[PDB]
């Protein structure tokens, strides 16, 4: 099986290729052609030209209809997209089917609808001569949007950027993660088959440094770079586009906390922290890797979580009651197991997990690890401060509300937090004091595409979602008429 | 020893001082204490800590009242601020009195008012269990705002950042231009006398590279850097904050066009382009340095503009009919004159100006140049494409509408444009096609503080004004309650 | 044919029926069962109950999809809807096909979209005790919406109300005009086939006074009455709902002017006023019945419009180049011809028309009149001040801009106005001074569903369109949480 | 003393006068001159004319500044305003001082501020010919606003209407309650001394039916009638303006509930219901006259409330620890005592109060009654369903959440409700189900002037507050430019 770039309406190979590997069993899924600098230039230029072609002449309404057509096309190939996400990543099929693929479809439909409903502003003003002036704003396409995305929820995060970009009338050059190229390549097929004009959507495959990703970031022809990934990568990209002063929007790492207050529904909080720590095998940017539980219920919480964690089924994506697939790759697993050893070196108690399961079948050639809970580290331990991106959490007791707020906030990251409490005042009083972009109370990972989304501190720069997307992916121009 | 830093509620000197020179006559006005890195650190830490003191406990209504007090305090010392602005810059007293200081005061009043009226959003959503969830947003202080400002409209541009920063509950570390330190120092005393708590507003003086500006830019304690100045400096700052992923907001250079169609009110357009070319001796970022005039009215337009330009009075800030003061510095004057010569070398006709006036008095020791009009350069001439930031414009003829639109947009800058036409269709049709942040029709430099304001391409990153400032200077946090 | 009511998911007949006559030839199209007070009661109660059923449990997203399905269901039977509107009203087929049915579909699709994208407000406040409070707002269904609609654009105006009502989660009892019952009845079939729950949409046929219209209006079970029709009728309805303080939204009569300035594109203005005067045989509330033309071009304009009006083809709905059908009914034609005579009596010069065309075939039994232009009446003439609602206009000269603005505003009505001028300032200066809900410049009847729509003075009460509909058809509720 | 009307910038008397009685001691405070129909016409015509005068030429910033000048004028005579409100209404001095006058001043400042920051909308649209069109909206003054207001919080409720009316550039004819004419008359002096142009604000004294209130409501010269008062009065006014189709905004009666759940903070709930029942001697429209308390805490609740109610000091407005003044007048006291008896006759147990206190001084000639608590009535009792508007409440046990929601909602009124609970889910789940305009959770009568305010069913029509006021008190006009 082979995955080509899609540039100016044509699927094309490249001089070099790389392997896409199935993390479940370590087997080759496909060969992926790595776009070189010459090909990235071709994509950007094609995207610049497409802005002046038929795409650029579409009414907002016709543009929106075509985008609903893109979504219809994904839906018409639903299970192919499910199979592509699962193969690349080891994601349980049930989660790809009910969450990932429908959300990627919803991304297109929501931003197409926002495109149709969105409007801008009128400001009247007085002038010296008494005749007045009017200032009105308009939204125009920003230009060519460079999209660079990660491997953890590949189609969802890719379309989260591509949908608003296109809804705002931009053209796109998009570089998915080398670990998860397939569903982006299928999306290119859907675009083609839907009649999306050539150059409007371009797909380039490859890596970051000295590859497609870096070349995209360096190209003078883009107007913006939108990015989801590691904070360090964000910094590198920000430096790269600096001379061009390109617009930038970054969703970066986190080390998210969950707080369980004494008045929590304890069984629910146990279930919720279980989901927030081990969903996608801890490979969601929104996962909790630090947990704070009031001292009065600490021991009961930890015992309860251990029992639930140990009932998790780790195995095949379509295995009967499977809860966790593997990590994305052998390389990522090396990093996570290296953090497993560090926790022990730092003096953790391993409440459960802390190694890899033994399957005695092909899964032993994949990249699985066990769900893991630690106890007994200090707030300054590396395993409590650094993002691990695996199925892990450290649990720590606390006594006082102001205390735990400060401890949650004591971080260079600030993406998300989940809080468990049945008390009205506490929910609102505490939530507003947490230094993050997103707080959930008594739940986790609930998303409404209308809301602003982003992080603070090292977890990002800017916000997207709803009108924040419509603003980021557009030129906002002011036109002032003297009457 | 005259102009001090203001750090954590105290005026402090520094280890070294630099001269502030009057561009009217080259005389020493004052010595300015240059903040060193240790003092910049002290300012950022004090601002960090002030977020945790009484300032951070004010209601939005009390904060807004205090900000109106700052405004009142400027008003109460109105003529001192005029004198300080005039001394530093050579600005005509009439202009500083009727435009600069009033507009500085309006920045504070407008952002104080917007702080009281602003609200956020409520999103209801359905959930699988049928009980729903509520998502709501809140604006919170972003943190410590680093402000780095330019010399051209010193107090106006300084307060354009400081007012929204404070209105959103932030604390501030602000570095005005080394060329124009006085009004900002007076503002520090106004803050002090109004009882702004210590650490909320801090003033550090100095240069850019290897001085207070660079140091502010590198400090991990700030949450954002908002900047107005040269594009190259914007790039440098973007790189400097990259490792911290700090929020950035840049208002950068331009090479703005004016366009005059055959159906313009010719006298009004001549008057308008005279203002847009030579106001503040061509030292406003929004000035026109490129002008395109329809061939049918070209000669008449140039002839009329020459007449009006030669009637401009260039002299003392309190001289009876003064229109233009000097340039900001000898150093800037040398650069503008280097362009004056480049224009001739590039083949220009000098319609008027092209040199420095001879005053036969102390003004000859200052930094004056003549209002200058060029004709005969090609679109690729350096003098037609690089920002000069002096009292100059090149005038070129055009024939077709799509032609002049292309020539206007054929630039790495895109700050503003002015269009002169009496035709309703043309006004709206052409304006929407100009790739800039701001288009004026039949006027220039009308500003309503509610409007989004910014540039595209090298002219900027992001937008400020109205809700765009309220959003930039705030954390926008989403709180999601499961019901 | 027979047209039944639709009450609680069942098509039902009534004790009595009335004739629906084809205005083309006077022939019987169908019998229509007239709802009595008892059936109106059944519809209202069923509507109240359906609010507590499955309809009320739908998510906004599922409600919007069901509303898109209604729209699909109309599309699926598009030509039946065309044939129904044409039969009832004599509308040229081309207009019904390109304008009326597609707009009725768009009403559902647009308000379904708005429902998905709409949100509400979050207000934070300080309190004495320093802990604060949160006020958030929600949009809830108002309840049962009573809809009473007119005969001139039957399906379009009927769905303009029913779409937002349903999109906001309300249930509906709707009473279309007795002259034009067919497309509304077809719409009930679409609702049924699409699986809209019983009681959500109820259709009651009948008249106004002493019939279904009045009975709806008196029923204490409705929460709102939204209405489009004559100002007099509006006044009657307002009195009727007064004891119950029902929410009301009225779009009422007009006596709309067109103004043609000396710098107009004259040929385009002639064509414009032709359309605004004689579209739908002058039976649109937005038509121009008063026209003011600058003295310098008055004679040429009148002569030009005469020529164009005499070129209009008045004939069968599917006749080759047909432009005008008949009036709605013999009774309406009696009223219009009564004004034709009054005009002559008031001293008008009949420039063209002023009677009935003679066909010498079955159309002579229909309700046709001639397009008519008058000249020579004073501003106080009844024919210049009272709404005729036929294909007529009076044309008068003017000299001065303030004079003509005053003459346009000298009316108890204030729905719309169209202005013709090529001049940028004049367009904006004059438009803002016209005391109406809607001004068009160099066009007429361009409608964007997101805009506010409504009239002033006798022409209405309230606004609909965009968020104004979302607000009118919802309870806006404030919830204040003390923290 | 004498209270004059204020018409076209002159204080004027009338042919007839009526007495203003102090309810504390039944002494005459002043004679009030009753506007006749001719004086009302004179006021309306002056307001119409003033729209075309200097008022109408003010920039929004100058208008706002003059409105702040009105507020300043009130502040400068603060204690005079306090004395006026106290004299008229018997309201405790501390309450008029810390709440009523300050809030009246804030009404002006807040709507002045909103006027400066408010803006409107721009909609771009595609057209057949590919050139497009622009629709923009503007806010214009609606015209002459008729204001009719109640006696319970005279200045607060008066200025709640007058402030947005004027902030939106309208002119005003205002008729305060005959029971409380003083603070409004003082306000006219402030308007006069602040230099508000003649005709902009006109004050007419008199009664309702066959007096100034009725004449206002019948005058064809107004553009809107905004009203706060009884529901039957609202219905009367709605009929009165119907023929002119005037815009209407009604804030009408309530029979508001408070609900105390088992998990409430009991002492806080007891204090909260004490305030919500007996504030202003129960003469606020927002007061709780019905209380539902969970069965498990009902007895403890009633006993607590009895104690706290009996601690209330009923007496002189300036008496040391005074909590309650008298009722507004002897007539109102007759109605309230009539209810007190009816409560007995209907089966009520009197837990406390139920008659009039005995002073043995001039207060016995006043209009005092005792704070009263009933128990043992059915949900259908008149005393439980009809608004009494005195310091009274009935308390009833409940068991189930859905039960008490249904009992709260089983009312022809729907103004406000307060809920007491410490549980997060319950607070939000129950609040959204209460069919009123305003729900408070764990507090009462907290008011943020940006929020929408209004009632459902008999409690009102329309919303006011924040942009809801900016919309109601303005013409929203759409201007569509074909390009
Ligand atoms: N709205 C706008 O877009 C706008 C408005 C006004 C001026 N400008 C631009 O500003 C420029 C003129 O002002 P200027 O000469 O003062 O610009 P500048 O870039 O040379 O300096 C501006 C500020 O940045 C500081 N600075 C310089 N180097 C720095 C560094 N390495 N690190 C941190 N800070 C540094 C300076 O000390 C000064 O305070 C023009 O390009 C003009 O177009 C833009
Ligand atoms: N936010 C609210 O909804 C709110 C607020 C405060 C008071 N209220 C209500 O106000 C009522 C008590 O106030 P009130 O006793 O002064 O009401 P009142 O209705 O009887 O009338 C108040 C005003 O209306 C005038 N008026 C009376 N009859 C009129 C008529 N026929 N035509 C024109 N004007 C007429 C009166 O002169 C007076 O100025 C209560 O029902 C209370 O619920 C409601």
UniProtKB/TrEMBL annotation, chains A, B, C, D:
SUPFAM superfamilies for this protein: ALDH-like
Nucleotide-binding keyword on record: yes
Molecular function GO terms recorded: nucleotide binding; oxidoreductase activity, acting on the aldehyde or oxo group of donors, NAD or NADP as acceptor
Keywords for this protein: NAD, Nucleotide-binding, Oxidoreductase
NAD in keyword set: yes
InterPro entries xrefs: Ald_DH/histidinol_DH, Ald_DH_C, Ald_DH_CS_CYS, Ald_DH_CS_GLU, Ald_DH_N, Aldehyde_DH_dom, OHmuconic_semiald_DH
Pfam families, A to Z: Aldedh
Domain Aldehyde dehydrogenase: 13-477
Superkingdom assignment: Bacteria
Binding-site residues, NAD(+): 149, 151, 175, 178, 209, 229-230, 233, 251-252, 335, 387
Active site (catalytic residues): 251
Family the UniProt entry places it in: Belongs to the aldehyde dehydrogenase family.
Protein name, per record: 2-aminomuconate 6-semialdehyde dehydrogenase
Species annotation: Pseudomonas fluorescens
Gene expressing this chain: nbaE
């Amino acid at each position: 099986s082979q995955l080509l770039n899609y540039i100016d309406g044509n699927f094309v190979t490249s001089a070099s290729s790389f392997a896409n590997i199935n993390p479940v069993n370590g087997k080759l899924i496909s060969d992926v052609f790595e776009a070189d600098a010459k090909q990235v230039n071709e994509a950007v230029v094609a995207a610049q030209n497409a802005l002046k072609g038929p795409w650029g002449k579409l009414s907002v309404q016709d543009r929106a209809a075509l985008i609903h057509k893109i979504a219809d096309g994904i839906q018409a190939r639903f299970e192919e997209f499910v199979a592509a996400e699962v193969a690349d990543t080891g994601r349980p099929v049930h989660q790809a089917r009910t969450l990932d693929i429908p959300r990627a479809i919803a991304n297109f439909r929501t931003f197409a609808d926002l495109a149709k409903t969105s409007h801008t502003d009128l400001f009247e003003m007085s002038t010296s001569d008494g005749s007045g002036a009017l200032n009105y704003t308009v939204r125009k396409p920003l230009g060519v949007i460079g999209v660079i995305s990660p491997w953890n929820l590949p189609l969802l995060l890719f379309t989260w950027k591509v949908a608003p970009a296109l809804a705002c009338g931009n053209t796109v050059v998009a570089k998915p993660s080398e670990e998860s190229p397939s569903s982006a390549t299928l999306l290119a097929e859907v675009m083609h088959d839907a009649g999306v004009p050539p150059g409007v959507f371009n797909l380039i495959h490859g890596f970051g440094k000295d590859s497609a990703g870096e070349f995209l970031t360096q190209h003078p022809g883009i107007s913006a770079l939108t990015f989801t990934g590691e904070s360090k990568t964000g910094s590198t990209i920000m430096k790269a586009v600096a001379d061009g002063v390109k617009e930038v929007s970054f969703e970066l790492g986190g080390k998210n906390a969950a707080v369980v207050f004494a008045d929590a529904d304890l069984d629910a909080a146990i279930e919720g922290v279980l989901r927030s720590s081990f969903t996608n095998s801890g490979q969601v940017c929104l996962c909790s890797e630090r947990v704070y539980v009031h001292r009065s219920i600490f021991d009961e919480f930890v015992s309860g979580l251990k029992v639930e964690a140990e009932r998790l089924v780790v195995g095949y994506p379509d295995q009967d009651g499977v809860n966790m697939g593997p990590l994305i790759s052998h390389g990522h697993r090396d990093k996570v197991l290296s953090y497993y050893r560090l926790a022990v070196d730092e003096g953790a108690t391993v409440v459960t997990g802390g190694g890899v399961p033994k399957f005695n079948d092909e899964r032993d050639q994949g990249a699985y690890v066990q769900p893991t809970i630690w106890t007994g580290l200090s707030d300054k331990a590396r395993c409590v401060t650094e993002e691990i991106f695996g199925p892990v959490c450290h649990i720590s007791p606390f006594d006082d509300e102001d205390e735990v707020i400060n401890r949650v906030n004591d971080s260079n990251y600030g993406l998300a937090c989940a809080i468990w409490t049945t008390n009205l005042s506490r929910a609102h009083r505490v939530s507003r004091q947490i230094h993050v972009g997103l707080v959930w109370v008594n739940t986790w990972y609930l998303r409404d595409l209308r809301t602003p989304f982003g992080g603070v501190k090292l977890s990002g720069l800017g916000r997207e979602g709803g009108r924040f997307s419509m603003d980021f992916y557009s030129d906002i121009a002011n036109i002032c008429i003297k009457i």
